[PDB]
Amino acid sequence: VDPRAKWQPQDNDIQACDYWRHCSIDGNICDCSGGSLTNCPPGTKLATASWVASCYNPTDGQSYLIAYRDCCGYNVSGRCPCLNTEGELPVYRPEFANDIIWCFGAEDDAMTYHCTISPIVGKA
């Protein structure tokens, strides 16, 4: 609703695009294809790489640093697709660039994008 409206996080449904941790997600939620909010689905490869974002926890009034690692080596899930860009910078500042495939580091050289996890890596 109003794709151009300020982001408004919630903290009650991790499979929705307005879930607080997904503030800078690009792709699909892993929780929708056999994974979890922070774990990869069976068969996929966890990347060591990530793009980061600092997202607001509406519940505690705090911000935490989110490391968006991708689960790779599979074709895109196609379930629960999102694209959030809270504080996303151009490609020339990759740390915070979300169009890049953050599969670097996955075993077996998996570089295909399947889904993205939203683990917290620290405050603020």
Swiss-Prot record:
GO BP, one annotated term: amine metabolic process
Cofactor note: Uses a protein-derived tryptophan tryptophylquinone (TTQ) cofactor.
Cross-link (Tryptophan tryptophylquinone (Trp-Trp)): 51-102
Localization, UniProt: Periplasm
Annotated disulfide bonds: 17-82, 23-55, 30-115, 32-80, 40-71, 72-103
Record EC number: 1.4.9.1
Recorded metabolic or biological pathway in which this protein acts: One-carbon metabolism; methylamine degradation; formaldehyde from methylamine: step 1/1
Sorted UniProt keywords: Disulfide bond, Electron transport, Oxidoreductase, Periplasm, Signal, Transport, TTQ
One MF annotation (Gene Ontology) recorded for this entry: methylamine dehydrogenase (amicyanin) activity
Assembly description: Heterotetramer of two light and two heavy chains.
Family of this protein: Belongs to the aromatic amine dehydrogenase light chain family.
Protein name: Methylamine dehydrogenase light chain
Gene that this polypeptide is encoded by: mauA
